Each structure stands twice: as structure tokens, then as C-alpha cells.
Design a protein around this ligand. Structure first.
Ligand SMILES: [Mn+2]
Ligand SMILES: [Mn+2]
Length: 230
């Protein structure tokens, strides 16, 4: 009945030595993880988490999306702990994670960190995740302006943490964007909305990467654009 058309793109950017973002996109699961750590232990962290989510794409659909998602993330976060325990040569490594799991006309959203999920629906663009950062707290509390908001952040580091989990409606015509801060830091939401207007999902995704890079590509930039269609 309802199906996804998706496009994932990731680029190292114009500055960073390695790409510490990891991404997955398939017919049921979209997922993105921005890793961090000394010596690109951070590609390790982001891969471990994506690797623990992957099975949700091909597993028999669906059932309790949030619970599956919650379990997947906890599993990724235990892998990271195990990694750190086996080499304090990885101490402090971690990753953000934003993922969506689809089933029929519902979806589960799981999030922790400063990667983002957005919905384009009936011509409006909304951010369906909230950055888990000190700056976000400050702006929410009117303590700094949104502009001064242009680190200190929740992350999967192997220490137990519950991410945010939200069940939502998946509607024919929805367009979903997942992105790392390497997109949303250099590129405003008005410009992202423009790119999200491009019909073909691959070309929209390609445009976003191009726009981050035109913006100086200061960080790894990763996107998944996806449509819910009849
Ligand atoms: Mn990173
Ligand atoms: Mn980043």
C-alpha cells in the first residue's frame, strides 16, 4: 500500500580528514549517525550503531516500532561500551543517532544528539527532532538568540541513556529529511526547504550535499531524503 523512495548521500566535506558519519537507507529503515572520538574512533562508533539498526530494515514488519528501535539503539550503545572496554584507546568515542522505522502509515522516530529529522508535509517544513545540546536549551529558554545559536551534547558513548522515541503518522506525499550537523550548520532551513522541493529524491539529496559544500563543507555532511508514496 504505502512505500518509501529514498536517497542517501554522505560526503567528507572540504576540511575533515575522515568521514565519521554513517548512514543507512532502505525500504523500511532510514538512519544516520554522526560519530566523534580521538583518531577517527568516531567512524567506529557511528558504524557500530548503524550496524545494530540494520536488521530492522529486513526483519518481518512490523509490530512495536518504538520498542524495536529502542532495543536496536541500546544494542549499538552496548557495542560501543564493549569497544571502549577493550581499548581505552577509544575512551570518549561516541555518536549521535537519528533513525526512522516505517510500517504502513505509521513510523517510529528515535533520536539522540544534534543530527536532525525534518518533515516536509503540505508545503510546510518542520523539524521533528530537537537538538540535544546546551545551545538548544539556551535558545529554548531565550537565554541566547537563535542567530547566536548559528560539543556539549547527548551522545551514545557506551554509557546507558534513553534516546527520544516518537510514534508518528506516515502520510502519502510526506517528504522526510535526516541530516548530520554538516548540513544544517552551514545551510539554513529556508535553503533546505528549497532543495526539498526538487521532485526526484536522489537529486534533492545531491543538492543538499552540494549546498553544504558550497557553504564551505566545514564538517562531514550526510543526508537521507525519502518520500512516502502510493
Ligand atoms: Mn562527527
Ligand atoms: Mn558533524
Amino acid at each position: 500500500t504505502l512505500v518509501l523512495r529514498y536517497a542517501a548521500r554522505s560526503d567528507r566535506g572540504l576540511v575533515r580528514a575522515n568521514n565519521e558519519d554513517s548512514v543507512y537507507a532502505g525500504a523500511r529503515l532510514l538512519a544516520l549517525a554522526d560519530g566523534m572520538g580521538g583518531h577517527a574512533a568516531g567512524e567506529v562508533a557511528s558504524q557500530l550503531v548503524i550496524a545494530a539498526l540494520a536488521h530492522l530494515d529486513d526483519d518481518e514488519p512490523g509490530g512495536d516500532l518504538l520498542a524495536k528501535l529502542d532495543a536496536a539503539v541500546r544494542a549499538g550503545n552496548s557495542a560501543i561500551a564493549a569497544q571502549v572496554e577493550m581499548e581505552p584507546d577509544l575512551e570518549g568515542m561516541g555518536t549521535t543517532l537519528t533513525a526512522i522505522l516505517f510500517a504502513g502509515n505509521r513510523l517510529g522516530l528515535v533520536h539522540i544528539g544534534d543530527s536532525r529529522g525534518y518533515l516536509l508535509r503540505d508545503g510546510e517544513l518542520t523539524q521533528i527532532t530537537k537538538d540535544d545540546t546546551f545551545v538548544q536549551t539556551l535558545v529554548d529558554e531565550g537565554r541566547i538568540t537563535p542567530e547566536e545559536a548559528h560539543l556539549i551534547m547527548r551522545a551514545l558513548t557506551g554509557h546507558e541513556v534513553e534516546p527520544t522515541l516518537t510514534m508518528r503518522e506516515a502520510r502519502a506525499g510526506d517528504r522526510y529529511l535526516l541530516c548530520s550537523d554538516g548540513l544544517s550548520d552551514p545551510v539554513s532551513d529556508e535553503t533546505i526547504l528549497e532543495a526539498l522541493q526538487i521532485p526526484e529524491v536522489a537529486e534533492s539529496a545531491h543538492r543538499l550535499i552540494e549546498l553544504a559544500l558550497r557553504g564551505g563543507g566545514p564538517d562531514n555532511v550526510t543526508v537521507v531524503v525519502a518520500d512516502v508514496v502510493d
